[PDB]
Subunit: 342 residues, 4 copies
Amino acid sequence: HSYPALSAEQKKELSDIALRIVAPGKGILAADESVGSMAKRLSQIGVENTEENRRLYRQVLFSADDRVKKCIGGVIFFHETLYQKDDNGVPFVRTIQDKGIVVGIKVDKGVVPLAGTDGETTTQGLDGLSERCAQYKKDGADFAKWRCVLKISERTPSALAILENANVLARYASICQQNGIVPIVEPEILPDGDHDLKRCQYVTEKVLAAVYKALSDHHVYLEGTLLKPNMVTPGHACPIKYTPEEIAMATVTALRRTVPPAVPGVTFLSGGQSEEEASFNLNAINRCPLPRPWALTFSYGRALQASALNAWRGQRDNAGAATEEFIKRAEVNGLAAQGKYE
Amino acid sequence: HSYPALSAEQKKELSDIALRIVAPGKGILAADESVGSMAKRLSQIGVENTEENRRLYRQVLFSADDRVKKCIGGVIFFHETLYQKDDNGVPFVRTIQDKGIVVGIKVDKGVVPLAGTDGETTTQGLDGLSERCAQYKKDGADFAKWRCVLKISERTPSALAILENANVLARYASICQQNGIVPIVEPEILPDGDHDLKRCQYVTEKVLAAVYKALSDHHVYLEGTLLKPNMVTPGHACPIKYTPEEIAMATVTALRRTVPPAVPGVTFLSGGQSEEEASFNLNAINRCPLPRPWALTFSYGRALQASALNAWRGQRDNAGAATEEFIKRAEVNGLAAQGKYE
Amino acid sequence: HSYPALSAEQKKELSDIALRIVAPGKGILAADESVGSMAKRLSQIGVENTEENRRLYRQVLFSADDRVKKCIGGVIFFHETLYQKDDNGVPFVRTIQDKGIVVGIKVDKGVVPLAGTDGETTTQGLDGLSERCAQYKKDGADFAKWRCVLKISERTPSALAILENANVLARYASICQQNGIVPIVEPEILPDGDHDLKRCQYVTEKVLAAVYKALSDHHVYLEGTLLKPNMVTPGHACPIKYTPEEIAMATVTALRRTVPPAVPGVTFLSGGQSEEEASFNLNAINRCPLPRPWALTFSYGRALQASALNAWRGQRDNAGAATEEFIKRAEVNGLAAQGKYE
Amino acid sequence: HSYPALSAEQKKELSDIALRIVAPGKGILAADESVGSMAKRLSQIGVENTEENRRLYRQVLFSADDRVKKCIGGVIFFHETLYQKDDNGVPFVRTIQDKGIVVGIKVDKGVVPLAGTDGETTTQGLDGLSERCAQYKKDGADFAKWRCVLKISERTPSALAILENANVLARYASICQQNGIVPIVEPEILPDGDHDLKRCQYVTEKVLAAVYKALSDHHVYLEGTLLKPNMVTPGHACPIKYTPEEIAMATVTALRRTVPPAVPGVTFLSGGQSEEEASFNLNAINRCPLPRPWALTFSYGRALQASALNAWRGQRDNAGAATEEFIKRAEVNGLAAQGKYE
């Protein structure tokens, strides 16, 4: 029942790519904002949601200088963006590549409804994914991202929701690897709700436990993957206050009860945390007493570009300032990714 | 954990549609041949594989007269075809509809490789399926077909292959029903191989057992579905000869050990059987001593149009003869679907 | 992967035994009351809970005359009782056997706690069960009973509780059959709670769906088993009133969405129903419009001996009256088992 | 769905006990030989299989001096033995306890047949296990052992065999922990066969993956357990020769793809290896380049007492020599448990 999914050479390539991304003090810039979600972010600072205005903004990020090299191991592109160029006619991909940063693409095609559940979902994107990966690889991508979304309520992460999702992730992962692309498995358990830290840890543990069993079933090569989970934290509506110490404690405990040592790194998602909240929590995590067999860095989206976006404000002059705001957060998180951030 | 997937009204509509299709002495004409597989069939009789030549041939089938009404409960269309018209400018859908026959569409988007298996597969098509169903319904379809393919060898229907597939079917089924479309769950276990009847029955039983547990997990409404399995039979390469009695015995036993009584009908697939072989076996099945809580008819593809296609031979004159060859088989199978075929 | 669990001869013996038990108008007398639960029942009518007082009472039941032959297909014994004799020194087993009624024994060794759940359980008894079955068979038993217990609450029939239990049943069943003993699979979903009919049906459907998938996994011979489920009904504390018609409707729907046609019969458990309530509901079930591929009779405990026990009251004179009260209910339920009870 | 299986205090006690056992340079002496298997071992050196001859031999082991303290973290007792005393009337348990070594008992009640499989099994012992654990704890035991057995052949570790077993282990584990007893989960994949290293690794990975998912499902506290797997190695009948380096490489890879970091230690089973083979392989493992989040020591049976038993030969004089042979192997393996054995 063992028919080698990957050759020795292939496993190597995947493992290498994976390790480069989560290399010490390095994290991931998640700039894979769909043209849709991008509309919301741009609206907050004025800016019409044009393809141009998006190219312009992405440029603000990608034009960061060399100090971004020490803290950014990879950049997740949104399809559109993967084919855009800066004002000099230089492919954004080219630029990031030249700085030695790894290139990636969001490949999932959005979340969809699970009939019979309490507003739960699953994710689509598997159709033609293999051809697409082959193409993306051919265009410079070495890793991908697929986002599943789970929710916590009186009865939400349901057997079905956990069953599916865990399975979809495994499918997606399997397909990426046979195309020389490291897959970031992202089983995001939303913070919405008034649940306490205990509960989030519980649910996180059960979800991950399922996710890895699925990966096993689908013969996914663990050492050639990355996990992008949510940090275990109270619901946005939970009244209780917690120490980033307490959060780090629960998060690391959860992870070390479910993630096999073979996984090279866990790239946390900023979620609804503030630029600082993310940095503090990440730092705390990397300072947790408990032993960690894997890299514990970041794969932040807003937590890396909030202030940056706020500075730019659509103005061509504010470009450099915006870029600074980004490089700043990129650097601090690069430190938090080693617990050495004060 | 019970959040009503379907309203009472909806369950009704599905159940009705299902029952109309498998009504006594009625079966399904499977004319959902992909433009690809259609090339092979047309090549055998000359005929260039044009959209026109296909429209022409499908016309030969759909132009059958009213005696087709007693034996054909439904017709499965291939996308393209669902929008073609006869020489009078009349939508093929319209015609079939006017005869009171139910309209259906193949919605799966083909089989794909399961990395790490011995040439096993799964099926894709889930992306956007809900929107598509909504559309197809709006265009006259009331039921759909999705084909998964399993294979028998020293170690083929693997836990993974059975796990996935069973799951995909459940997903597909779930989506169809929330769009008022009865789904035909088709877990086809290919005949290729030299395995004996015993083995095929075994594998068939295990596969189905998984398929229904999956449907349960996904909250699929059984009484609003149909099962299109393979009849349990020896591998094409099995030396041993079996009575259609023996085949019927194994097939019915397998089905009654796995299919819940709630499933309205099982529409067998002709597979690699000859026009007669299918009719004989189906008849035998409907004459099996064992009790059957469900309709046991047909959902034949080649077994209904082999001779028809052979007669037409692409000639406009042979049209009527071709149509006769079809109506003939359609009628006999309509009889075999009641065990009353001599 | 198919290594014949049972020979053709063996499958036959099991199937026969099964069918004899659920033969038309016939049901099961469940007199397998543990010495513990027997204490409670005896206390309600005075009577010290002695081995003798128990033998005496069981005698009241087993001394029923020949009219018990038309409505009682089998009698479930409690270990102790299986070796007791009437006042004439005649083995209770002998007596029941001579009337052509089938003999059975409760073999489970009680329910136990599932650590980490909300007061949920599982059942023990598997240790040495094979040797025990071999013995019981050698002593006249041809079928056995094992009771698992599930509970309905905001979050009770938990994945774990359903997973285990379903699995234990399968183990127990598998072991019985390899010892020529038909196993009664009893996944009882308690009525406690204020849940409505809808919910009980839902939970019942999910539990059964799991139970049969388990049986499949363990290679249990379905046509050589019997299902002793709870009728789907509202919780004891549900305010809503339901027609025995409504109850029959839900119960049969649930069963026909999960039980394969191969199962010879479903022997409902009286649960907390009154002698009449059980009879009415059973009758209604057997009069439900929906088709049923299996026998739908009873495997009643209190519902057959409530009034009987109440009459006896421990008095040697009241013996005959008590026996009458039993024969009465046994007969009516034998009618309800055919929907012909007014 | 989270109802705390263990209190904070309890989790602590378990974790501590676990860590003491696998403390650096320390391993486990497995002297839990059933009176049955003990007959075979004694026969090889003459010695009648008496309770006395067994007590005598166990004494040879337990009378080891203080240098056994640095390499032996725990001793697994066979029930009988747990209540035997040395010639001075001193409880073997007392002695081991005074040296600060942890006491454990085999609790499984033997392997049994899985009907329908190719000579596969499962393990029994769950009946009354909770009461028994409570007792054993009360008698000085702090950890237990349960052995499941899997086999490798063209089609042996079957879905069923893996499903069950993994489940039984989880049950056993769950019960032990609620009784303050650390459970050693032993899913032994036998070496019998002519399969190569690759295959054993594959099967080992799949089995473990299932085992841990099961533990999760049953809410077993990982950091309060221990894993006693087989080292991944070729079948006894495999022609190919492998470096203990190669064996260590496969073994560690397998383990780090399945065992969560939370598991304190993996105590390998000597299996059919020779006293040296076990020591060499263990050493190699502890010298493998790959990172290991857990202790990698031994839980040897014959590999610790082969020569010891061979020396004793039943002679009262050879006692001391026998004891030396044991202490010798105990020490070397204590070194191999740190990769520092030459």
